[PDB]
Ligand binder design. Structure first.
Ligand code: 4CA
Ligand code: 4CA
Ligand code: 4CA
Ligand code: 4CA
Lengths: 139, 140, 139, 140
């Protein structure tokens, strides 16, 4: 759909109805150590002033780092959810696309950490996200 | 005023209902120079595939609230305000109801304002917090 | 010594030899939900430019939030260590004292979170720290 | 040059050996506009009562490194540089040896520089990371 990891037979919310499907996030590559995703800029991703909403970068990074963790851990009986999301903004984006690259830097038993880079169509670094993902056994 | 955001301009590039904010339904309640509140009714549009409120939704609500709260004061002074850092920490998920946010200003420097935002559930539990650092600069 | 919680019979490093005792951190009050500490500014707390080192605020906050967690959890078979320390600086300090107040905002099963405020002798907010403390069973 | 910090001034308010940096023994190794390294030998002065390197020690090493690395370039340009945000995340403790830090510049704006700092052990493992946001302003 958004090309999210297929790890379960049923999902509570269909992609098109989720926040992710509504703004248009799509996973591109995915491996245990690195994943990418992107989104086309539309007014649905912007704030009233015409720039891509800061929350959009946050959300792309959160989905990308978390889903990339899920991809590995789901099949191991674990649940993966974001515990901390620290996004820093360097340059705005008015149009085009937002591309994210998440690089795994730590995979502990209870926490995985990913560095996410958010770039524009020109390849410029527009924002970064330090994603801390909690890993716990499913209930 | 579509989601009750501060009327500081005659015109805006994107209408409320078309923005991310309008799409997910964020609405500002109170707004003062030192404190602001807003909320959103949870619907699937606010959730991730697993059925919970998306982490990014809390980050966005906090971001919009703190920034707009800064804009309410500085716009007229000829400044622009945009977030420079958003650090959101998640304590408990939200599956349904509303997400209620309260932003309290803790520092108002000449170049940066800082707000502590608490995000609660209908039962009043602290579900997430966001430390928002807002850059303040003069418009071009 | 530094008035740290007395929870064990032996400690690997004596207060006076630790980083805390070397810069002079002292716990004032301590309860499960709130704790305070302070330090006199000396050159040992400063950087070459004469201001209190940013790392000093970080360290005060980290010791204070962690030790306050230890105070409750130690006796329960758990270990408490900092997992994330996010310190933001609003105003420098050149002399006097640094006073910290840590307020517990979340006490989960595996994570405790504290908001730490760092003030000067005039009571001004000089910095803040969001301390995320991991709680795990002792080995 | 006491701990090999950038010589950008004739005189400094506090001598190396007297500062926090000198007391704990931080030493700068390489230093360029886009990348800097430093290290410290672990001793009790770097530890907490439980025998591990104090979290605050990593935060301080990262802080000093990123800031001084910014100072090396901007001082001569009449700017002052001070950290505005230090976010350090801890992955694995260090009990002894050294702590080695590498700061990589990722953004150099007109008012903020941002450095990613990695803190490793003697075995090269990633023990902590720090996101350092440095404010750049003109001196008074
Ligand atoms: C935060 C925590 C526990 C999270 O675990 P994780 O990310 O899931 O990683 P992990 O569980 O796979 O284990 C990584 C390593 O952490 C340590 N660790 C993890 N869990 C434990 C535990 N229950 N007991 C002891 N060490 C542990 C071990 O060194 C472990 O490596 P190993 O399994 O190969 O022996 C782990 O990353 C960590 O220990 N990071 C270091 C925390 C740190 O050193 N903070 C600074 C020290 S406390 C500050 C302080 C200051 C003043 C005071 O007076 C008191 C405290
Ligand atoms: C980040 C910064 C500059 C941003 O300004 P702001 O948030 O907009 O607030 P503001 O502009 O209204 O000014 C607040 C205070 O900051 C200081 N400040 C601001 N701009 C400047 C400046 N250009 N020059 C000197 N002090 C300044 C002043 O004390 C000011 O109080 P004042 O205006 O009443 O004199 C301000 O919040 C600040 O200075 N925070 C303190 C930063 C700090 O002390 N970091 C720790 C020291 S650096 C670590 C280090 C370690 C080892 C080394 O070898 C070197 C460095
Ligand atoms: C991070 C974590 C697990 C840490 O646990 P803690 O701080 O030690 O707190 P805690 O263990 O005492 O439990 C607090 C609550 O968290 C939830 N929780 C904790 N552990 C679990 C678990 N193993 N399974 C399910 N829920 C859990 C429960 O609601 C629990 O409350 P309860 O025990 O009364 O039922 C917990 O604080 C938490 O669940 N916070 C909410 C995390 C969150 O909602 N992040 C956003 C959702 S994921 C983003 C995403 C975006 C797009 C995608 O496509 C996928 C994911
Ligand atoms: C934070 C800030 C201003 C600091 O400047 P800096 O780090 O020193 O970098 P810089 O000064 O060299 O400038 C970098 C770029 O920032 C933008 N910028 C900087 N200063 C300004 C300014 N005064 N006016 C407009 N754009 C500016 C420009 O695009 C500039 O590129 P350019 O100089 O080539 O034109 C800059 O990094 C930045 O703009 N980051 C993007 C902030 C952002 O886009 N946050 C998300 C949007 S706000 C969320 C929101 C949500 C809902 C609402 O209802 C309202 C707001």
């Amino acid at each position: 759909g958004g090309n999210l990891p297929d790890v379960a037979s049923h999902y509570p919310v269909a992609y098109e109805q989720t926040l992710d499907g509504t703004v248009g996030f799509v996973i591109d590559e995915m491996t245990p150590e690195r994943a990418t995703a992107s989104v086309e800029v539309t007014d649905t991703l912007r704030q009233r002033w015409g720039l891509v909403h800061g929350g959009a970068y946050c959300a792309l990074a959160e989905m990308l780092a978390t889903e990339a963790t899920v991809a590995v851990v789901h099949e191991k009986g674990m649940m993966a959810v974001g515990q901390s999301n620290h996004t820093s903004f360097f340059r705005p984006v008015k149009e085009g696309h937002v591309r994210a690259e998440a690089v795994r830097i730590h995979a502990g038993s209870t926490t995985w950490f990913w560095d996410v880079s958010l770039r524009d169509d020109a390849g410029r670094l527009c924002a970064v996200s330090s994603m801390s993902i909690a890993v716990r056994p499913r209930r």
